[PDB]
Scaffold this active site. Structure first.
Site, mmCIF file in Angstrom:
data_model
loop_
_atom_site.group_PDB
_atom_site.id
_atom_site.type_symbol
_atom_site.label_atom_id
_atom_site.label_comp_id
_atom_site.label_asym_id
_atom_site.label_seq_id
_atom_site.Cartn_x
_atom_site.Cartn_y
_atom_site.Cartn_z
ATOM 1 N N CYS A 1 0.788 -1.237 0.000
ATOM 2 C CA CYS A 1 0.000 0.000 0.000
ATOM 3 C C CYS A 1 0.824 1.293 0.000
ATOM 4 O O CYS A 1 0.300 2.370 -0.324
ATOM 5 C CB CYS A 1 -0.899 0.037 1.231
ATOM 6 S SG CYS A 1 -1.672 -1.565 1.585
ATOM 7 N N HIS B 1 -8.508 3.922 -3.409
ATOM 8 C CA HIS B 1 -7.149 3.540 -3.034
ATOM 9 C C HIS B 1 -6.612 2.629 -4.126
ATOM 10 O O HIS B 1 -6.580 1.405 -3.967
ATOM 11 C CB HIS B 1 -7.204 2.833 -1.670
ATOM 12 C CG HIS B 1 -5.899 2.258 -1.193
ATOM 13 N ND1 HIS B 1 -4.670 2.783 -1.525
ATOM 14 C CD2 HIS B 1 -5.651 1.217 -0.361
ATOM 15 C CE1 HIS B 1 -3.718 2.079 -0.935
ATOM 16 N NE2 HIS B 1 -4.289 1.128 -0.218
ATOM 17 N N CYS C 1 -0.904 2.704 6.481
ATOM 18 C CA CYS C 1 -0.665 1.322 6.891
ATOM 19 C C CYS C 1 -0.371 0.506 5.641
ATOM 20 O O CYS C 1 -0.687 0.923 4.528
ATOM 21 C CB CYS C 1 -1.876 0.753 7.633
ATOM 22 S SG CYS C 1 -3.436 0.767 6.687
ATOM 23 N N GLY D 1 -0.211 -3.573 4.047
ATOM 24 C CA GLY D 1 -0.502 -4.992 4.173
ATOM 25 C C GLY D 1 0.756 -5.806 4.455
ATOM 26 O O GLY D 1 1.835 -5.500 3.949
#
Lengths: 394, 392
Positions: free
Chosen positions: B90, B345, B377, B379
């Protein structure tokens, strides 16, 4: 010896094995990489938590999966959850790019210790295009040229620069020869980390434990007439064959880097010193000329001259391309791939650039004080070249 | 002293995957116009760029790197300018920006482009082959494979983030993105994409120009959101409405030594200060910014109160809300023009496009808006954060 210099305190690789049929064919990608990562920590006895990032060059298959596999590999190697991981992709040069990214991050003050690595399982991940091609691609020659088979790219270099079929077959002989010699002389023993894995019998589905400790792609008895009998893969009147191309392989490499001042504080012997890195673009249709452009750039940046380099690791993507760069830069072939190359050992795409650093540094070390400067360099699919200059450690 | 500065930062509109405006646009055609705008804005010779680094997550690796080479060619870069991709899930788009800054600081080259690209239409999330049985031997390894939505529920439960709190955050994101769009606050950063829409049934093609983010639903209400069902755990609180949207888009940032921008007479949009990427427990990966932000701020010699604006990715309302509370940041300083719950996103694009969103809003707010942060954040359990300083 300035304290802020980026030094290498360990550099290792897995054995490289033939894709599909070789020793690592039943080995998860994370299981190829993890032992190599762990060996870096075992050698230096640093707290693994001190590592600022683990950067892994890797090329094939889905990005997200491979980045996840890298995170899992680090966990298997005993790194704590606080140590992050990422991957990088500049095709064939990815493993070296990873080393250069860690060197840059240290120089920029992002962190003081990092690991640059490379990983490829050409067994697990095919190289096919997914979906249709944008119709716009054909409207731009350079864009269209990016889709050319690497092999056609080989033939192009051959013709444009007059590289004889015999020269090419010769280099393949010289590769298989030097690789077998190095293997027998134990010159790969220090850099190789054995992989404890399994071999699965396709007929039964039965697993049995095995330890892969040696490169399995070498063909010691390969003769210039064995190669003469091979038919061109990409053209009828061509001069590039399976025997004058790198082998498809599985493997991994990894390098531990830190500020000189840190290695000193920890009393760690310095295996090598990172000096410079260059990545440049060249025409996609003859991507093979990559090193011919990248090497001079890295050398120049290092305040050096080509003749000042004692050892080269120039990837053997194709003999055509391999010979041309040698001739073009006018380098003594006795200074290039002294322990053999990818035509004999294999070219696990992402791993090559990292594993070649280990191969380069350990050999420079064995040759003693007089082997002061080395270079790792490769051509890159879609038309690029990369090169890094390294200096002797101690 | 010779800081890495940003002279231009742009993005495409972000569109809903599969059904949105970019659904029939190839990945290279999403990125190319954004890369080109960096050159159009500054009028530098494209040949002066030392590297083009593109965060991207879901494509086959080799293919996506080739697609980026092609995009750069479409945008007018000569063959001598190299390209590569990077993947930290991400955070990839922001990572690319950090890699260029690192490279420039290291003396590798003087000018480069950090970008991000994702077509979640084209590239499904998918796992190839079986899972290493070794995961059953190490909880952290296995936790890497947890669905992101499960990590969301884990954060909401552990830190007592209520369903109402999460739903309200979504309502706010839709209102703020809608307001920003209507006020023209995205006009400077967005590069329109001239492309086409194809009728799945007939195959009829219509030319369109996409210029606004199409995931926004201005009327989203608590009542609407309270009716949604949890998708990953029957008794949970994470819903589609409080998760980021799946999207297509790109972002790109042109960086160089301050001295080079001054030499060229280029106005400075922003200054790169610091970057942090840290590991956290995979099962609660959403806490990433709660760890990365203090690290980046510390490295910059600042405290959290010194930061005027934050772009913290809205992966899930659970972790988005938690990070705000944990760091004790005034919510009025975070995602002031809304975020991923409303505009989406597109994985690799997000970190790069948020640099454009942040810097253009900092500019608009004037001199008193001095420091900004992009953070997300990641993954598999990571966080990343960068501190930027306002330009001029």
């Amino acid at each position: 010896v300035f304290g802020d210099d980026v030094v290498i305190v360990a550099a290792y690789r897995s054995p490289l094995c033939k894709a599909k049929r070789g020793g690592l064919k039943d080995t998860y990608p994370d299981d190829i990489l993890a032992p190599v990562l762990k060996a870096l920590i075992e050698k230096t006895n640093i707290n693994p938590a001190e590592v600022g990032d683990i950067v892994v060059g890797s090329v094939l298959g889905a990005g997200s999966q491979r980045a996840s596999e890298c995170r899992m590999a680090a966990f298997y190697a005993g790194f704590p959850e606080t140590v992050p991981v990422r991957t990088v992709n500049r095709q064939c040069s990815s493993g070296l790019q990873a080393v250069a990214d860690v060197a840059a991050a240290i120089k920029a003050g992002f962190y003081d210790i990092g690991i640059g690595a490379g990983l490829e399982s050409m067994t697990a991940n095919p190289m096919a295009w997914e979906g249709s091609v944008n119709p716009k691609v054909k409207t731009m020659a350079q864009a269209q040229d990016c889709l050319l088979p690497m092999g056609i790219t080989s033939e192009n270099v051959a013709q444009k620069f007059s590289i004889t079929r015999q020269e090419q077959d010769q280099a393949a002989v010289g590769s298989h020869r030097k690789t077998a010699a190095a293997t027998a002389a134990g010159r790969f023993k220090d850099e190789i980390i054995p992989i404890k894995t399994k071999i699965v019998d396709p007929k039964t589905g039965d697993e049995k434990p095995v330890t892969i400790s040696v490169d399995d792609g070498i063909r010691p008895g390969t003769s210039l007439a064995d190669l003469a009998k091979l038919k061109p893969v990409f053209r009828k009147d061509g001069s590039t064959t399976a025997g004058t191309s790198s082998q498809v392989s599985d493997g991994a490499g990894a390098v531990l880097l830190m500020k000189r001042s840190i290695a000193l504080q920890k009393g760690l012997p310095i295996l090598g010193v990172f000096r410079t890195f260059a990545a440049v673009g060249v025409p996609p249709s003859i991507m093979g000329i990559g090193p011919a452009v990248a090497i001079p750039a890295a050398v120049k940046a290092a305040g050096l001259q080509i003749d000042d380099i004692d050892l080269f690791e120039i990837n053997e993507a194709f003999a055509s391309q391999f010979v041309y760069c040698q001739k073009k830069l006018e380098i003594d072939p006795q200074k290039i791939n002294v322990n053999g190359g990818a035509m004999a050992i294999g070219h696990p795409l992402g791993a090559t650039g990292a594993r070649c650093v280990a191969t380069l540094l350990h050999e420079m070390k064995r040759r003693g004080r007089d082997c002061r400067f080395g270079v790792v360099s490769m051509c890159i699919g879609t038309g690029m070249g990369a090169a890094a200059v390294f200096e002797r450690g101690d």
